[PDB]
Design an enzyme around this catalytic site. Structure first.
Site, PDB file in Angstrom:
ATOM      1  N   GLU A 212       6.253 -10.647  19.649  1.00  0.00           N
ATOM      2  CA  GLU A 212       6.198 -11.618  19.738  1.00  0.00           C
ATOM      3  C   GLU A 212       5.954 -12.562  18.429  1.00  0.00           C
ATOM      4  O   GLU A 212       4.188 -12.054  18.331  1.00  0.00           O
ATOM      5  CB  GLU A 212       6.027 -12.615  20.646  1.00  0.00           C
ATOM      6  N   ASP A 214       5.218 -15.816  16.960  1.00  0.00           N
ATOM      7  CA  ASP A 214       5.341 -17.240  17.118  1.00  0.00           C
ATOM      8  C   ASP A 214       4.575 -17.877  15.468  1.00  0.00           C
ATOM      9  O   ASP A 214       4.243 -18.271  15.227  1.00  0.00           O
ATOM     10  CB  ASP A 214       4.414 -17.260  17.844  1.00  0.00           C
ATOM     11  N   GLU A 217       5.060 -22.937  16.761  1.00  0.00           N
ATOM     12  CA  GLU A 217       5.101 -23.627  18.045  1.00  0.00           C
ATOM     13  C   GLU A 217       4.877 -24.906  17.836  1.00  0.00           C
ATOM     14  O   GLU A 217       3.326 -24.732  17.778  1.00  0.00           O
ATOM     15  CB  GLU A 217       4.318 -22.911  19.012  1.00  0.00           C
ATOM     16  N   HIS A 228       1.717 -11.602  17.998  1.00  0.00           N
ATOM     17  CA  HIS A 228       1.248 -11.100  19.281  1.00  0.00           C
ATOM     18  C   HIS A 228       2.017  -9.671  20.092  1.00  0.00           C
ATOM     19  O   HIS A 228       2.734  -9.337  19.793  1.00  0.00           O
ATOM     20  CB  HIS A 228       2.338 -11.864  21.005  1.00  0.00           C
TER      21      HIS A 228
HETATM   22  C1  LIG Z   1       7.880 -19.746  22.228  1.00  0.00           C
HETATM   23  C2  LIG Z   1       7.866 -19.155  23.614  1.00  0.00           C
HETATM   24  C3  LIG Z   1       8.440 -17.501  24.082  1.00  0.00           C
HETATM   25  N1  LIG Z   1       5.568 -18.517  23.562  1.00  0.00           N
HETATM   26  C4  LIG Z   1       5.187 -18.302  24.015  1.00  0.00           C
HETATM   27  C5  LIG Z   1       3.655 -17.419  23.126  1.00  0.00           C
HETATM   28  O1  LIG Z   1       3.577 -16.242  24.109  1.00  0.00           O
HETATM   29  C6  LIG Z   1       2.743 -17.635  24.153  1.00  0.00           C
HETATM   30  O2  LIG Z   1       2.752 -18.121  25.448  1.00  0.00           O
HETATM   31  C7  LIG Z   1       1.683 -18.884  25.588  1.00  0.00           C
HETATM   32  C8  LIG Z   1       0.020 -18.904  26.198  1.00  0.00           C
HETATM   33  C9  LIG Z   1      -0.686 -19.579  26.526  1.00  0.00           C
HETATM   34  C10 LIG Z   1      -0.718 -20.433  27.612  1.00  0.00           C
HETATM   35  C11 LIG Z   1       0.878 -20.326  27.765  1.00  0.00           C
HETATM   36  C12 LIG Z   1       0.739 -21.045  29.102  1.00  0.00           C
HETATM   37  C13 LIG Z   1       2.428 -21.507  29.238  1.00  0.00           C
HETATM   38  C14 LIG Z   1       3.574 -20.519  28.402  1.00  0.00           C
HETATM   39  C15 LIG Z   1       3.338 -19.845  27.539  1.00  0.00           C
HETATM   40  C16 LIG Z   1       1.638 -19.628  27.492  1.00  0.00           C
END
Ligand SMILES: CC(C)NC[C@H](O)COc1cccc2ccccc12
Ligand SMILES: *[C@@H]1O[C@H](CO)[C@@H](O)[C@H](O)[C@H]1NC(C)=O
Ligand SMILES: *[C@@H]1O[C@H](CO)[C@@H](O)[C@H](O)[C@H]1NC(C)=O
Ligand SMILES: [Co+2]
Ligand SMILES: [Co+2]
Length: 434
Positions: A212, A214, A217, A228
Site C-alpha cells: 500500500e 498512501d 491520508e 507500506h
Molecule cells: C486509507 C487506508 C486504507 N490506509 C490505512 C493505512 O494502512 C494506515 O493504517 C493504520 C495505521 C495506524 C493505526 C490505524 C488504526 C485504524 C485503522 C488504520 C490504521
C-alpha cells in the site's frame, strides 16, 4: 460472488492526464467504481439479503463456498445512495448520505474500462492531484492511495468471482483487511464476528493483504505520506490472527507492515506547515496541489503548490537524518527515534520498490475510524502519551475527537474533492494539460 442487475451499474466518468517526458499531456477517460463492501449482497434469484446489518444469512451462507454460489453483488446508485459525484476531472465524496438507509463514506477505484481497473507503474514517475480538504474536520480521512490489486478484481485466479472489477472486487491493503465480505471468490462468513461499535460491519476468518502506497491520508488539520511494504507484493489471502493489521489482536504477526514509514510534517516538528487559515504555509481552507515523485532509488520526493507558490516537503531533523526526502535513512531514523520495527522487518523501501515497479490501482476514499478514531493521523497517539514522548503528537485534534457516531451526527455534510489527476515521468506533470 456473481453480479446481479436489480440496480443498474453506471460508473461515474473521471478524466485524468497522462504526461510525457517531451513536455505535453494528453487526456485519458476513465471512471470510478465503489468497493464491493458498500454494495447490497443478495440471493441470485430473489431480493433476499445474504448480508444484513452486520450478520450473514445462516441459510444462504452456511459456509464460504455456498455463500459465494447463492449470492451476488448488485449495482450502486452513486449520487443518491453513496454521495459520490464526478464532473470532468473532479471527484467528490460525501461523508454521510441519507437515502432509504444511512451510508457512511465510500472507497472507489479508478477504472480503465467498465470491467477493468487502471494500473499505474509508480517507479520513475510522479503523481499530481488537486484536493479540497476544507470540509474535513478531526476524525475524518480523505485518502488517495495505491494498492497492488489485480486489474480484473481477482476473476482470473478465482472463477467463483464473476462480478470482478465492474463491481469493485479484489481489494487489499497493508492492514490485511478482514472486514471484507468477499475474498478470493469466497465469502468471509466463516469466523465472522460482528463489530461491537458498528451496526454495518464485522471481522471474518480471512483477510486480504498487499502493498500500500498512501500518497495522501488527510483532513483540514493533518496530512501524511506513508509507504507500506509486504513480504508478498500483490494480493494474497491471510488466515485469522495470522493476518496482522488493525482487525487482528496482534498487528505485527502477519505478512504486511500496518504502520509504514510515515511522513507527517506536524509529527516531525513543523506545526506551522499545514492547517486552516493564513497562519499556515498551506491554507487548508483553499484547494492545494500535491505532487509525489518516485525516483528509481526507491526514495519518495514531494512538493506542494498553492496560489502559484511552490513548497518542497518541509525539512525534518530526526536522529542522524536531515532533509525532506523519504528514503531508507529517514525510515531507519524514524524507527530509532519514534520506535517500531515493522517497516524494516518487512523489507523497507527495497521491498516496497517491488510494488512501485509493478502495477498498482488508484484508490480514493472518505472514511472515519471505528478502531482508533483517526487519532493516529491528527491527534496524540497513544492518548496517554504527552509531547515529551517522541512522535506522539501527530496533529492538533483532541484525543477525544473522531468518535464515529459523533462525527457522523455533527458533520454529515463533510466531504473531500479530488481533482486534476496528472501522471507521467518525473518533472512532467507541471506542463500544460491537453
Ligand atoms: C486509507 C487506508 C486504507 N490506509 C490505512 C493505512 O494502512 C494506515 O493504517 C493504520 C495505521 C495506524 C493505526 C490505524 C488504526 C485504524 C485503522 C488504520 C490504521
Ligand atoms: C515549516 O516548513 C515551511 C516550508 O518548508 C518553512 O517555510 C517553515 O519555516 C517551517 N517552519 C518550521 C518551524 O519548521
Ligand atoms: C501509556 O499506556 C501504555 C499502556 O498501559 C503504557 O505502556 C505506556 O507506558 C503509557 N505511557 C505513559 C506516558 O504513561
Ligand atoms: Co481458510
Ligand atoms: Co533522491
Amino acid at each position: 460472488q456473481s453480479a446481479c442487475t436489480l440496480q443498474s451499474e453506471t460508473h461515474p466518468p473521471l478524466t485524468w492526464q497522462k504526461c510525457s517526458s517531451g513536455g505535453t499531456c494528453t487526456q485519458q477517460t476513465g471512471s470510478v467504481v465503489i468497493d464491493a463492501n458498500w454494495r447490497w449482497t443478495h440471493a441470485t434469484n430473489s431480493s433476499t439479503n445474504c448480508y444484513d446489518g452486520n450478520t450473514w444469512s445462516s441459510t444462504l451462507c452456511p459456509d464460504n463456498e455456498t455463500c459465494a454460489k447463492n449470492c451476488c453483488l448488485d449495482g450502486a446508485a452513486y449520487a443518491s445512495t453513496y454521495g459520490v459525484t464526478t464532473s470532468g476531472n473532479s471527484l467528490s465524496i460525501g461523508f454521510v448520505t441519507q437515502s432509504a438507509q444511512k451510508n457512511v463514506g465510500a472507497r472507489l477505484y479508478l477504472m480503465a474500462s467498465d470491467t477493468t481497473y487502471q494500473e499505474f507503474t509508480l517507479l520513475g514517475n510522479e503523481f499530481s492531484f488537486d484536493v479540497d480538504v476544507s470540509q474535513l474536520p478531526c476524525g475524518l480521512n480523505g485518502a488517495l492511495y495505491f494498492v497492488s490489486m489485480d486489474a480484473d478484481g481477482g476473476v482470473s485466479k478465482y472463477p467463483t468471482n464473476t462480478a470482478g472489477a465492474k463491481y469493485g472486487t479484489g481489494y487489499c491493503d497493508s492492514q490485511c483487511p478482514r472486514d471484507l465480505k468477499f475474498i478470493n471468490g469466497q465469502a468471509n462468513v466463516e469466523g465472522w464476528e460482528p463489530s461491537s461499535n458498528n451496526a454495518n460491519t464485522g471481522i471474518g476468518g480471512h483477510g486480504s493483504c498487499c502493498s500500500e502506497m498512501d500518497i495522501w491520508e488527510a483532513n483540514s488539520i493533518s496530512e501524511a505520506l506513508t509507504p507500506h511494504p509486504c513480504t508478498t507484493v500483490g494480493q494474497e489471502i491471510c488466515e485469522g490472527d495470522g493476518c496482522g493489521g488493525t482487525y487482528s489482536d496482534n498487528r505485527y504477526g502477519g505478512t504486511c507492515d500496518p504502520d509504514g514509514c510515515d511522513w507527517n510534517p506536524y509529527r516531525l516538528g513543523n506545526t506551522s506547515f499545514y492547517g486552516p487559515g493564513s497562519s499556515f504555509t498551506l491554507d487548508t481552507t483553499k484547494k492545494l496541489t500535491v505532487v509525489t515523485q518516485f525516483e528509481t532509488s526507491g526514495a519518495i520526493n514531494r512538493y506542494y503548490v498553492q496560489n502559484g507558490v511552490t513548497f518542497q516537503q518541509p525539512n525534518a531533523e530526526l536522529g542522524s537524518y536531515s532533509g525532506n526526502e523519504l528514503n531508507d535513512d529517514y525510515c531507519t531514523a524514524e524507527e530509532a527515534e519514534f520506535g517500531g520495527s515493522s517497516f524494516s522487518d518487512k523489507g523497507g523501501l527495497t521491498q516496497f520498490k517491488k510494488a512501485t515497479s509493478g502495477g498498482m490501482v488508484l484508490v480514493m476514499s472518505l472514511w472515519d475510524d471505528y478502531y482508533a478514531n483517526m487519532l493516529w493521523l491528527d491527534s496524540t497517539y497513544p492518548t496517554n502519551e504527552t509531547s515529551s514522548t517522541p512522535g506522539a503528537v501527530r496533529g492538533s485534534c483532541s484525543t477525544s475527537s473522531g468518535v464515529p457516531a459523533q462525527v457522523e451526527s455533527q458533520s454529515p455534510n463533510a466531504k473531500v474533492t479530488f481533482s486534476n489527476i496528472k501522471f507521467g515521468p518525473i518533472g512532467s506533470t507541471g506542463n500544460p494539460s491537453g
